[PDB]
Amino acid sequence: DPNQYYKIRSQAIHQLKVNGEDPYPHKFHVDISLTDFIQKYSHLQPGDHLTDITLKVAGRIHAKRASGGKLIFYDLRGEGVKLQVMANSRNYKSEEEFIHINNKLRRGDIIGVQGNPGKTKKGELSIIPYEITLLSPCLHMLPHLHFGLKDKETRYRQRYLDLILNDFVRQKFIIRSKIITYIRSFLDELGFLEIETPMMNIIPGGAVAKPFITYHNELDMNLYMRIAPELYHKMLVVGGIDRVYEIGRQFRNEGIDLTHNPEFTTCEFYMAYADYHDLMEITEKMVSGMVKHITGSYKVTYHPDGPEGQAYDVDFTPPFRRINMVEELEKALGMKLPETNLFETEETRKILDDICVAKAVECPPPRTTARLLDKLVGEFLEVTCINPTFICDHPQIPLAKWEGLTERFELFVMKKEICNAYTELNDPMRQRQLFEEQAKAIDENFCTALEYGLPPTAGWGMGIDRVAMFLTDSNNIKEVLLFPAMKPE
């Protein structure tokens, strides 16, 4: 069993220490990465052996296949590449020390290799070791070679084991970092200032979201983990920093599952003297440019239900489809809806309720205008948004800006919102009124800031984790979080 293997191996390692062969006190200086070792010496023809060149490589042993006792082959792994170590007893420092190192090494051990490049008769590039050094043994039993960790729960609870055994996982978080790095580069080149704003607030945000509450001792007061940096960003726009963005963590005290995590990453930027239409060009350039630069093409494949399930083609080629919500809902329903400034009335609500019935689009027991419109929008518009599609001018039925239609777009990809933009409010009187009525159902410092004068501004937000899922062909959030929150063992 795995526990016995662990007890046996830990004993053998303890014995190596008392014998003065402690593997850990060693430090190993690599002369060439495995990736570069391949590049330089992949041109050698079968049977080559560069006796003159001695180099030091390191990596993790994934396979050990003997060939009589005079020859052992190791599958040395690292950086996502493979390199064969052909341990030939003749070529080792001595026969006695060749036997001794092979006796102690097991699958999974970290080792450094000093030897000469070369290609075997079968033609696979190798390094012929003059000396192999154990640097850090693997004390636990790993799965059988071509087996691995299929159990997602284990993969998520032991990410280091997941990366040791599954190369596709490493490529995911490389993709994740390239997304964040691309956003910074795109926005920096537009003159945006990357900023950091408080993650702990003296009062909870004016938003529907159960918060993380923590207590500050010296202040004798509770602090609240942030849900978003918006109000800090607009205070800086008032201060004269016209273009600000922040790619940082947000916190929500809610339920954990395959699509929700208590901490997650968002990007927000605010741009003075812009409206939601100006941000549509920017969103199209960034998102499309991001996809092509990272993946090599404008067309991506996504598996909403797993590799075995259906596969959707997603075409990020510009221009992205644009739609005005009400007009397209009318065109999709084949009927004219009430004029947009009569959407608060109870007569319009009835009409929507009837429409949902007549087309078998059932609504939550709360059959309101907001909910009947939500499920109509979802069933007739959002579901058709396979390619990147801007959905704009949503009915108010409360922030944003104003003939009954909100100044805004949401960008949908694979039937889901990945980012959205708003034209911002700057009337300090109106912003105040919202706060005080919201507080009966307030940020005094932010109201004051608007009293000094916020210019016309446009806001923009994106959920990074969702974007990482769609571009890594992942269908749960635990695949794109290095150490996802997990329910108790």
List the Cα angle 259/264/268 in 5-degree steps.
Answer: 120
Identified binder of ligand ALY from the candidate list 288, 389, 420, 472, rule CB under 6 A: 420
Contacted by 330, from its own copies, ligand ALY, none: CB < 5 to 8 Å by type: none
| Beta carbons of 23 and 65 less than 8 angstroms apart | no
List the one residue from 55, 72, 113, 223 that touches its own copies (CB under 8 A).
223
Residue 461 makes contact with ligand ALY by CB under 6 A: yes
From 311-319, 352-360, 378-386, 393-401, give the range in contact with ligand ALY by CB under 6 A.
Answer: 393-401
Query: For residues 12 and 351, what is the distance between their CA atoms, to the nearest angstrom?
Result: 78
Report the amino acid identity of residue 486: M
Reduced 3-state DSSP string for 280-347: HHHHHHHHHHHHHHHHCCCEEEECCCCCCCCCEEEECCCCCEEEEHHHHHHHHHCCCCCCHHHCCCHH
Contact with ligand ALY (CB under 6 A): which of 421, 469, 471, 477?
Answer: 421
Query: What is the rounded CA–CA span in Å between residue 408 and residue 393?
Result: 6
Instruction: For the CB of residue 127, give the shortest distance to ligand ALY in the complex, in Å.
Output: 30
For residue 446, state whether it binds ligand ALY (rule: CB under 6 A). no
First to last CA, the chain: 21
Neighbours of 358 (CB within 10 A): 10
Which CB sits closer to its own copies, 51 or 181? 181
Which residue's structure tokens are 């979201």?
Answer: 209
The residue range among 204-212, 236-244, 290-298, 457-465 that interacts with ligand ALY, by the rule CB under 6 A, is: 457-465
Q: Which does 267 bind (CB under 5 to 8 A by kind): ligand ALY, its own copies, none?
A: none
Confirm whether residue 75 is marked as ligand binding.
Answer: no
Nearer to ligand ALY, 197 or 420 (CB): 420
Whether residue 428 has a cis bond before it, omega within 30° of 0: no
CA distance 42 to 119: 8
Q: How far is CA 226 from the centre of its chain?
A: 20
Does residue number 400 form part of the binding site for ligand ALY (CB under 6 A)? yes
The bridge status of strand 81-88 relative to strand 125-136 is: parallel
Closer by beta carbon to ligand ALY, 306 or else 456: 456
Is 420 labeled as ligand-binding?
yes
Any contact of residue 460 with ligand ALY (CB under 6 A)?
yes
Using CA atoms, how far apart are residues 422 and 393, in angstroms rounded to an integer? 10
Q: Total residues at the site for ligand ALY (CB under 6 A)?
A: 14
Mask for 342-371, x = binds its own copies (CB under 8 A): ------------------------------
Rounded CA separation 277/261 (Å)? 32
Is 418 labelled as part of a ligand binding site?
yes
For residues 58 and 79, give the distance between their C-alpha atoms in angstroms, rounded to a whole number: 10
Q: Name 411's bridge partners.
A: 390, 419
Binds 210: which of its own copies, ligand ALY, none (CB < 5-8 Å by kind)? its own copies
From the list ligand ALY, its own copies, none, which binds 232 (C-beta under 5 to 8 Å, kind-based)? its own copies
- Find the binding residues for its own copies in span 26-85 (CB under 8 A): 26-30, 58, 60, 77-80
Q: Which does 461 bind (CB under 5 to 8 A by kind): its own copies, ligand ALY, none?
A: ligand ALY
φ/ψ region of 181 (left if φ > 0, alpha if ψ in -120 to 50, else beta) reads alpha
Binding site per annotation, positions for substrate: 206, 230, 268, 270, 420, 424
Binding site per annotation, positions for ATP: 252-254, 260-261, 417-418, 463-466
Which residues are near ligand ALY by CB under 6 A?
230, 268, 398-401, 420-422, 424-425, 459-461
Binding site per annotation, positions: 206, 230, 252-254, 260-261, 268, 270, 417-418, 420, 424, 463-466
